[PDB]
Coordinates of C-alpha atoms in Angstrom, one line a residue:
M256 CA 101.8 119.0 84.4
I257 CA 99.1 118.6 87.0
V258 CA 97.5 115.2 86.9
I259 CA 93.9 115.0 88.1
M260 CA 92.9 111.5 89.2
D261 CA 89.2 111.0 88.4
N262 CA 87.3 109.5 91.4
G263 CA 84.0 109.9 89.6
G264 CA 82.6 113.1 91.0
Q265 CA 80.4 115.6 89.2
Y266 CA 82.8 118.5 89.4
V267 CA 86.0 116.9 88.1
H268 CA 86.0 118.7 84.7
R269 CA 85.7 122.0 86.6
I270 CA 89.0 121.3 88.2
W271 CA 90.5 120.8 84.8
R272 CA 88.9 123.9 83.2
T273 CA 90.0 126.0 86.1
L274 CA 93.6 125.0 85.7
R275 CA 93.4 125.5 82.0
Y276 CA 92.1 128.9 82.5
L277 CA 95.1 129.6 84.7
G278 CA 97.5 128.4 81.9
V279 CA 98.4 125.2 83.7
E280 CA 99.2 122.1 81.8
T281 CA 96.8 119.4 83.1
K282 CA 95.2 116.1 82.2
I283 CA 92.3 114.1 83.8
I284 CA 93.1 110.4 84.1
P285 CA 91.1 107.4 85.3
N286 CA 91.8 106.8 88.9
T287 CA 92.8 103.2 88.0
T288 CA 95.7 104.3 85.7
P289 CA 98.7 102.1 86.6
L290 CA 101.5 103.9 88.6
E291 CA 104.1 103.5 86.0
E292 CA 101.9 105.3 83.5
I293 CA 101.2 108.1 86.0
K294 CA 105.1 108.3 86.3
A295 CA 105.6 108.5 82.6
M296 CA 103.5 111.7 82.6
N297 CA 106.2 113.4 84.7
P298 CA 103.6 115.0 86.9
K299 CA 104.5 118.1 88.8
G300 CA 101.5 117.8 91.0
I301 CA 98.6 115.4 91.6
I302 CA 94.9 116.1 92.4
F303 CA 92.7 113.4 93.8
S304 CA 89.2 114.5 92.7
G305 CA 85.9 114.2 94.5
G306 CA 83.6 111.3 93.9
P307 CA 80.8 109.3 95.5
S308 CA 82.6 106.5 97.2
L309 CA 85.7 105.6 99.2
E310 CA 85.2 102.2 97.5
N311 CA 86.1 103.8 94.2
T312 CA 89.4 105.5 94.7
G313 CA 91.4 103.3 92.2
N314 CA 95.2 104.0 92.7
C315 CA 95.0 107.1 94.8
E316 CA 96.2 105.2 97.9
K317 CA 98.8 103.4 95.8
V318 CA 100.2 106.9 94.9
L319 CA 100.5 107.7 98.6
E320 CA 102.0 104.3 99.3
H321 CA 104.6 105.1 96.6
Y322 CA 104.9 108.8 97.4
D323 CA 108.7 108.5 97.3
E324 CA 108.4 107.8 93.5
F325 CA 106.5 111.1 93.0
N326 CA 107.6 113.6 95.6
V327 CA 105.3 116.4 94.3
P328 CA 102.4 118.3 95.8
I329 CA 99.1 116.4 96.2
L330 CA 95.7 118.0 96.7
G331 CA 92.7 116.0 97.7
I332 CA 89.3 117.5 97.2
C333 CA 86.3 116.3 99.3
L334 CA 86.5 112.5 98.7
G335 CA 90.3 113.1 97.9
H336 CA 90.7 114.9 101.3
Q337 CA 88.9 112.0 103.0
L338 CA 91.0 109.3 101.4
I339 CA 94.2 111.1 102.3
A340 CA 93.0 111.3 105.9
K341 CA 92.2 107.6 106.1
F342 CA 95.4 106.6 104.4
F343 CA 97.6 108.7 106.9
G344 CA 95.8 107.2 109.9
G345 CA 92.9 109.6 110.5
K346 CA 89.2 108.7 110.5
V347 CA 86.3 109.7 108.3
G348 CA 82.6 109.6 109.2
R349 CA 79.2 111.3 108.5
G350 CA 78.8 115.0 109.1
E351 CA 75.8 117.2 109.9
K352 CA 74.5 118.6 106.7
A353 CA 74.4 116.3 103.6
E354 CA 73.1 118.9 101.1
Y355 CA 75.5 121.1 99.3
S356 CA 75.4 124.8 100.2
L357 CA 77.8 127.7 100.7
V358 CA 79.4 127.4 104.2
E359 CA 81.6 130.0 105.9
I360 CA 85.1 128.7 106.8
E361 CA 87.7 130.4 108.9
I362 CA 91.3 130.1 107.7
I363 CA 93.4 129.5 110.8
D364 CA 96.8 128.9 109.0
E365 CA 97.2 130.5 105.6
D366 CA 100.2 128.1 104.8
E367 CA 100.4 127.7 101.1
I368 CA 97.0 127.1 99.4
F369 CA 95.4 130.1 101.3
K370 CA 98.2 132.5 100.9
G371 CA 97.1 136.0 100.3
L372 CA 93.4 135.2 100.9
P373 CA 90.9 136.7 103.4
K374 CA 90.5 135.0 106.8
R375 CA 86.9 134.0 106.2
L376 CA 85.5 132.5 102.9
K377 CA 82.2 131.0 101.8
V378 CA 82.9 127.7 100.1
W379 CA 80.8 125.2 98.2
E380 CA 80.6 122.0 100.1
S381 CA 78.6 119.2 101.7
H382 CA 79.4 117.4 105.0
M383 CA 77.7 114.1 104.0
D384 CA 81.1 112.7 105.1
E385 CA 84.0 114.5 106.7
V386 CA 87.3 114.0 108.5
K387 CA 86.6 113.2 112.2
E388 CA 90.1 112.5 113.4
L389 CA 93.0 114.4 111.9
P390 CA 95.9 112.1 110.9
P391 CA 99.1 112.0 112.9
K392 CA 101.6 114.5 111.5
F393 CA 99.0 116.7 109.9
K394 CA 97.8 120.2 110.8
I395 CA 94.5 121.9 110.3
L396 CA 94.4 124.9 108.0
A397 CA 90.7 125.9 108.1
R398 CA 87.5 125.1 110.0
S399 CA 83.8 125.8 110.0
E400 CA 81.1 125.8 112.8
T401 CA 80.2 122.1 112.3
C402 CA 83.5 120.7 111.0
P403 CA 86.9 121.4 112.6
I404 CA 88.8 120.0 109.6
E405 CA 87.9 121.9 106.5
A406 CA 91.4 121.9 105.2
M407 CA 94.6 120.2 106.3
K408 CA 98.2 119.6 105.3
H409 CA 100.9 117.1 106.2
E410 CA 103.4 118.9 108.6
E411 CA 106.4 117.7 106.5
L412 CA 105.2 116.9 103.0
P413 CA 103.2 119.0 100.5
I414 CA 100.1 116.9 100.8
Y415 CA 96.9 118.8 101.2
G416 CA 93.2 118.2 101.6
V417 CA 90.1 120.4 101.4
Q418 CA 86.6 119.3 102.2
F419 CA 85.0 121.9 99.9
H420 CA 85.2 122.3 96.1
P421 CA 87.5 125.2 95.0
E422 CA 86.8 124.2 91.4
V423 CA 83.1 125.3 91.8
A424 CA 82.7 129.0 91.1
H425 CA 80.4 129.5 94.0
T426 CA 83.4 129.0 96.3
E427 CA 84.9 132.4 97.2
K428 CA 88.5 132.5 96.0
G429 CA 88.2 129.0 94.7
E430 CA 90.2 129.8 91.6
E431 CA 92.9 131.4 93.7
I432 CA 93.3 128.4 96.0
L433 CA 93.8 126.2 92.8
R434 CA 96.2 128.9 91.5
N435 CA 98.1 128.8 94.8
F436 CA 98.3 125.0 94.6
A437 CA 99.6 125.1 91.0
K438 CA 102.2 127.7 92.0
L439 CA 103.5 125.2 94.5
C440 CA 104.1 122.7 91.8
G441 CA 106.1 125.2 89.7
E442 CA 108.5 126.1 92.7
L443 CA 110.3 123.7 95.1

């Protein structure tokens, strides 16, 4: 079971449908779902979805505060990436290109979610906002010309962020990145 916390973005269903296509048990829940209830689902992984506003992240930060009750892989997508960054002591701010487009990224550490993938990928993303200061204890996994932090992970915990939307088909290997993340939740 991969739980997708709905932060209100336009592409949240695509995350769910991608996982379904992959044969992964998954459910979208309101981001305001109480933690106990999230715990009663026995999640093997959690996704913090995109959305319009850091002011509407519901209990995403609460999940991180209580990570010891979960101890499963977490993937933040765009706003989810940014909220993880803020929570862990990094900084988010405006980028230089607010419109969505395909952007080429360079994978600098294939780690887990980029395992087996090419070194450069075009991904569907905006930089209306982005991570400006990496959190302590995190490492960068991918970059682009205008944004050094296109993907990141905690150095010690399976907590991941991507700035772009792997759930959008335009993203090269987007389905594979989601698959790689799901495979992490099935092994430990």
